[PDB]
Structure 1
Amino acid sequence: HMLGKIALEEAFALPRFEEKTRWWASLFSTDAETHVKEITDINKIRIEHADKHGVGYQILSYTAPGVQDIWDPVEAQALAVEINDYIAEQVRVNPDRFGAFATLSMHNPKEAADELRRCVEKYGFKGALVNDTQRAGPDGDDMIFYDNADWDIFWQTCTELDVPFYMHPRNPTGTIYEKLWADRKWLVGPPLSFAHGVSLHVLGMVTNGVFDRHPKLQIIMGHLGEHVPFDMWRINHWFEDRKKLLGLAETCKKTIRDYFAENIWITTSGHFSTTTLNFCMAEVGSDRILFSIDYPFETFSDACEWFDNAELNGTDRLKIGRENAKKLFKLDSYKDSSA
């Protein structure tokens, strides 16, 4: 029904990574051959789906774990550059249907900032999408988080370009995988592990002052906010009435509710629940919620049939379906953008 929807947690993979794509599909797809075709296609199948389901514009991003899985920094950087150059060429075929987020190696703040800048200035990319922490160390068992002073140069590039950063999940790896997940491996990914990573990282940015140093910064979480809205009351209470009397206020100057009003966005990717959406409208506000699909891990049909037919007031259907994202991403037109 609604046309001109915007989706922005929508993944692609390079054709040359077929073995890696099949491994990820073995965990998260029930049809590996269709998955390979869909995750690598840009301008045919994806357009056909979008045309059937009222999706005017998609901001595309690299599949997880993507560059965040690559612990050799030279290899990781070369891969990010390769991906960005590739997708820029592909989305030129349909500029009224596609934009792109930058894919980044996050081993080094300045390097990541320069590549984001190249993507925005040269190609008109819409922001960055990164799959949680950067794998690092000689065998990839370490993790680089971005919630510290090293990353100020990077966050300032985001605010200067005035583009958002999407904190996407990745799988647990190395010792964390072995200690917590291997004996309950069916919880890896959407059932639990993904949200544990993203919520940790974003709440780390909150409590380490990233949004105080960079109050213009916009961070996006998928999956209706990776559990955080469920605990908005509890986090707020344990911040304002507990931890902020014990030292948290030194590095965290606003409430969790303020950060969701001013800095944080959530999307509907992979979480096609009107009951949960309504609860998020209460705890986060419809102005801060964006439609998204999570293709090809989720189908256009599941996401769009859900959203198009959900019981919702017309004002919020318009905002969540497209108008919030239109404003955030400064889109002056695209296919069906005012339908």
Structure 2
Amino acid sequence: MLGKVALEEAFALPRHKERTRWWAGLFAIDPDKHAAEINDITEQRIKYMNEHGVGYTILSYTAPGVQDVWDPKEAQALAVEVNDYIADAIKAHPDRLGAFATLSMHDPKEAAEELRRVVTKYGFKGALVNDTQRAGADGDDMIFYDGPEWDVFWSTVTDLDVPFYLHPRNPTGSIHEKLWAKRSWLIGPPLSFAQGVSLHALGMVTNGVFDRHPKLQIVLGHLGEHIPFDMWRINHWFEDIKKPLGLSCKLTIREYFARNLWITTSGHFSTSTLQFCLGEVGADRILFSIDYPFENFSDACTWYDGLAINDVDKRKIGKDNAKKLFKLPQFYQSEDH
């Protein structure tokens, strides 16, 4: 299928080339090719899109990104640097590339202003944030975004009417735990097995962020970070246990999934799991995505192009859902192969 859209697609800053290529060696083989790909915006990356039937991708700053930076002043500047960087690097190809805002999430009103700056001036499609914001004098605390003081940020998000993509971040736990994770081949991307996004997304639900922002759109990767697998358990926990003891979120977990959540196929090229999510989530709330360059175009689009599912859902998931959700340009698919 031609004209696909992907939106968990990462880039890094050229001035970090050496930091970046170091981390690439601890992730996958061929770190030279992956480091070059995650720095490239307009050459191989678009070549890959042409060869694999992808009309358009939305780019995001690679994790941990700004959410790893605990000094507020330094985090804000990096967000501005990154946003100005990527807006400029993609300007010539509006039919192939959009960008999500990178943000400092230290202060609710600083974050809302920077989203407004770059959405208004650059036409960014939303925000991609790598879970909680590291904070504290030496980064030992974290900032959650579901408290009442974040209402001002979510109202900016719905006012701009752009979605918010909640991407994983390497968990910051014990010394013993990180060393065990590294020695056990279980740490890092694309797996992100230790991720806290699924818990944090349930927090936004239980703390009413979607009751106060019923039009808010949050996007989850990895086909929903296993939440659809626990839909029954989560429903049971709300309706039968927690709501009876005081939990006041107005709707059911399935109603929030119908109004406020989206899942992408980032790094999850599973026909069986996708078909399972047709039941638990539905084709109308599922977005194709690759997680390039941690995943390669070929694995993602070979899989998706070959999906033996009904035509309407295959188009909705492959491109027509994102085309509307991210207000893609009409005739964007006339610039491919």
**What's the TM-score once normalised by structure 2's chain length?**
0.96
CA distance in 1, matches of 2:231, 2:335: 34
Gaps in structure 2 of 5+ consecutive residues: none
In structure 2, the CA distance between the partners of 1:160 and 1:119, relative to structure 1 (3 Å rule), is same
Q: CA deviation at 1:195?
A: 6.0
In structure 2, the CA distance between the partners of 1:55 and 1:215, relative to structure 1 (3 Å rule), is same
Give 1:104's aligned amino acid. L
Deviation beyond 4 Å, 4+ runs, structure 1: 190-195
Partner of 1:7, secondary structure, is strand
1:278 and 2:280 are equivalent in the alignment: no
Which residue in 2 is equivalent to 1:79? Answer: 78
Map 1:1-339; keep pairs closer than 5 Å: 2-173=1-172, 176-178=173-175, 180-185=177-182, 186-190=185-189, 193-194=192-193, 196-248=195-247, 250=248, 252-336=249-333
Partner of 2:59, secondary structure, is strand
Q: CA deviation at 1:292?
A: 0.2
Q: Is the 8 A contact 1:267 1:291 kept in 2?
A: yes
Q: CA deviation at 1:303?
A: 0.2
Q: Is the 8 A contact 2:129 2:164 kept in 1?
A: yes
Q: CA deviation at 1:222?
A: 0.5
Give 2:308's aligned amino acid. E
Partner of 1:104, secondary structure, is coil
CA distance in 2, matches of 1:336, 1:198: 32
Q: Is the 8 A contact 2:10 2:62 kept in 1?
A: yes
For the aligned residue pairs, the C-alpha RMSD in angstroms reads: 1.6
In structure 2, the CA distance between the partners of 1:201 and 1:129, relative to structure 1 (3 Å rule), is same
Q: Is the 8 A contact 2:223 2:274 kept in 1?
A: yes
Question: Which has the higher mean CA deviation after the structures are superposed, 289-298 or 194-203?
Answer: 194-203
CA distance in 2, matches of 1:281, 1:315: 12
Give 1:286's aligned amino acid. A
In structure 2, the CA distance between the partners of 1:80 and 1:194, relative to structure 1 (3 Å rule), is farther
CA distance in 1, matches of 2:176, 2:146: 24
Q: CA deviation at 1:179?
A: 5.2
Percent identity reads 72
Partner of 1:95, secondary structure, is coil
Partner of 1:254, secondary structure, is coil
Give 2:8's aligned amino acid. E
Give 1:5's aligned amino acid. K
Q: Is the 8 A contact 1:195 1:227 kept in 2?
A: no
CA distance in 2, matches of 1:148, 1:237: 24
In structure 2, the CA distance between the partners of 1:194 and 1:150, relative to structure 1 (3 Å rule), is farther
Give 2:4's aligned amino acid. K
CA distance in 2, matches of 1:312, 1:68: 38
CA distance in 1, matches of 2:191, 2:246: 30
Partner of 1:107, secondary structure, is coil
Q: How many aligned positions are there? A: 334
Gaps in structure 1 of 5+ consecutive residues: none
CA distance in 1, matches of 2:189, 2:242: 30
Q: Is the 8 A contact 2:228 2:277 kept in 1?
A: yes
Give 1:308's aligned amino acid. D
CA distance in 2, matches of 1:77, 1:205: 24
In structure 2, the CA distance between the partners of 1:264 and 1:338, relative to structure 1 (3 Å rule), is farther
**What's the TM-score once normalised by structure 1's chain length?**
0.95
